[PDB]
Structure 1
Amino acid sequence: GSTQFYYKLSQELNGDMERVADSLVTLQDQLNSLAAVVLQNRRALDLLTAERGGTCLFLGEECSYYVNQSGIVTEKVKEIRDRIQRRAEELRN
């Protein structure tokens, strides 16, 4: 069964990738969640150290800034999910 092994493997791939995509989304969701807390912490610190110019000036450091890249991961996930659907679609016609 050649045809058969092709369908089989395509569905194995698809079922693994559904779980990977799910995981990627959830890891990104947790970064987004955690970042809101971290930046609320930073704003609180900026107020506490305002007399000294806020957190970075207070320390005598260049500011570290968070670069949120949820857009990239979200895009890659949706592309993976498209590829899953396309493989199934192609087998279906």
Structure 2
Amino acid sequence: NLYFQSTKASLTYSQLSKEIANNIDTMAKALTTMQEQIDSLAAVVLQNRRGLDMLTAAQGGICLALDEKCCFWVNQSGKVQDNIRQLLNQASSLRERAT
């Protein structure tokens, strides 16, 4: 009698962890696609920057022409890619245990 209640509970947690694993996978897809868009947008931005620096070359670039502290992009694609790989590993580990 105690066996059946513990196995019915074990089955619910096995099924619940399979759902969590599918939610994690969906979240990893979303972050991958968003990082791809950030990487894509950044290359356009940096080319726009080089373009503005060329047009103001005699003034020493756009930041000196604007008389401002220069803004630089901080690429962090590697760390986001690591966060995604960790989520993908956490999901496969849960899907493994539940089976």
Shorter-normalised TM range:
over 0.9
Larger radius of gyration: 2
Matched with 1:2 is: 9
Matched with 2:40 is: 33
Q: How far 1:77 moved relative to its partner?
A: 0.6
Output the aligned Cα RMSD.
Answer: 0.9
Matched with 2:95 is: 88
Between 1 and 2, higher relative CO (CA 8 Å, sep ≥ 6) is seen in 2
Task: Give ranges in structure 1 of 5+ residues lacking alignment.
Answer: none
Task: Give ranges in structure 2 of 5+ residues lacking alignment.
Answer: 1-7
Matched with 1:46 is: 53
> What is the total number of aligned residue pairs between the two structures?
92
CA distances 1:59-81 after superposition (whole Å, capped 9, x unpaired): 00011000011111100110011
Identity %: 42
Q: Structure 1: which 4+ aligned runs deviate by more than 6 Å? A: none
Matched with 1:14 is: 21
Q: How far 1:85 moved relative to its partner?
A: 1.0
